[model samples]
Target: HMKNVLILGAGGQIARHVINQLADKQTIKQTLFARQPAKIHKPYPTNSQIIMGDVLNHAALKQAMQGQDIVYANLTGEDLDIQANSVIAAMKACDVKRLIFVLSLGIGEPLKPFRRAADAIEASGLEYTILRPAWLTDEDIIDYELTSRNEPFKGTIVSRKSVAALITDIIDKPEKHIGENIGINQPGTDGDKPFFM
Candidate 1:
């Protein structure tokens, strides 16, 4: 379990909640990273630290990862492969070990509809937990479950709160998992889960 955690793309919808949840815990330290710091500066938790940096900039990237125990990367864009490469290089350069990368479902798995994004992440030479969440929704989460790589769950949308919760769970135990991609969804979901459930 690491004490200090750096959140990449900290201003995103999901990171916002992760920041709120971790803020209440006294033992954990969170650093928020973003290009536009001023936007998120006001609403961030009191305990959190803010670092203005871009993922592709070596100086900026290295500066963010330095002295940090773990990274909760919430980065996503059109050029995911290039961005992922930069992340791998940054992790290697900084010697940071654990990463809870927020990736879409079917990223690298066989059943995944799009593997280019997930395929590019292999052999990064770092401990990683790739979370492939379903389509992403704003529903409330009372409970959720995680399934193994090959066993994907059925649902078109997964709540952002649940995604944040999953990241929090992993941070408490980093070495317990590595180089594994897990699928997550709300419990007792069906094909019409998002609307019907």
Candidate 2:
């Protein structure tokens, strides 16, 4: 099956890795959407298409999402709730069932408001995988650990490559990740403070 995958925040670091991996896989057709297309520094494969648009714009999001098999977002910002609203509305309109959304690990007090987006997806009745990664690092290492949402989130950092690999793996096998809120971090580096601190 030729998979039609739509990637949001395509210019981001992790998204670059995901895009490169997806590009190598001939079975997948990718659509990369970002507010600034020029910021996507990586060279994408011929099978991929790039679009410039804001997720906050419902019309643009819906157009980009049309006929997409899976939607993956690696976005973070204060306007997350609005962006999530747009994504969910567009996905519903296009009937796209699978979504892979990225959330941060510290989402309890100061980040409580950010939870609205994840909550919306879980309640949208769509097949969703919410990935909450501990402080992301630029490290090239692929070592990492995966924990369920219910468990105490451990570790201080996770390499961008590891998260990208995990996303690509889930893209290849979407069935295994539906309805999962996964926490990702480096093994044995478990600490209360972020790595940078």
Candidate 3:
């Protein structure tokens, strides 16, 4: 059975890697949703297509949710709460029970935008993998490890490709990581500053 996945806010840097990594995954039929779908260049996966949509557009989000097996939201900006709400609403309406959400890696101060969205989605009653990755680098290095949400954030940075590979692993086996709020970081980079600093 082919899995139908909707990649919302799909034009972000991390998402660009996710799409490319999954390019040959024939079992996963990808629908990349974004306001500027063209930013996601081809040769696109044979099983994937692009959709023009915004997460805040209730009609558009809901329409894209239909029959989607998983929703991987690569959303950002000041309206994260609204975006998360809209995403949750559409997921409930479409009864799409699995979500893989992305937010930044930070601690100490309560970053309300991400916190608000995180709080609601954790309570959204869906099987969710809430990933808060470390400061991202464009390096091709793929070495990384995970820290639970309750732990002090490990390492100060991780590679963009590292996070993308982790996301693809989760997408490959959707049943794992359910209900986990996790962080991905490069294992030996732990310190008072980023790896390069």
- TM-score of each model, in listed order: 0.84, 0.92, 0.93
lDDT on C-alpha atoms for all candidate structures: 0.77, 0.87, 0.87
Using lDDT as the yardstick, the better of models 1 and 3 is 3
lDDT by residue for model 3 (1-197), tens: 88888998788889888998887787888999999887777677788878899888899889889999988988888778888999999999998999999997323444777898999999999999999898999998899999898997778799989988988999999998999999889988778543452
**Candidate 3 local lDDT, residue 9:** 77
Pairs with steric clashes in candidate 1: 106-112
Q: In model 1, where do residues sit more than 4 Å from their true spots?
A: 105-114, 192-197
Model 3 TM-score, all chains together: 0.93
Residue 117 error, candidate 2, Å: 0.9
Residues 1-197, candidate 2: write the lDDT tens digits.
Answer: 79999999899889999998887788899999999998887666888999999998778888899999999998877778788888888999999999999986323464655678878888989999999888889997898888997897777789989999999999999997889899999898866554452
Global Cα lDDT for candidate 3 = 0.87
Q: What would you estimate as the lDDT of candidate 1?
A: 0.77
Backbone clash total, candidate 2: 1
Model 2 ranges with Cα > 4 A deviation: 105-110, 192-197
Cα lDDT tens digits, model 1, 68-103, are 888888876656666677777787888887888877
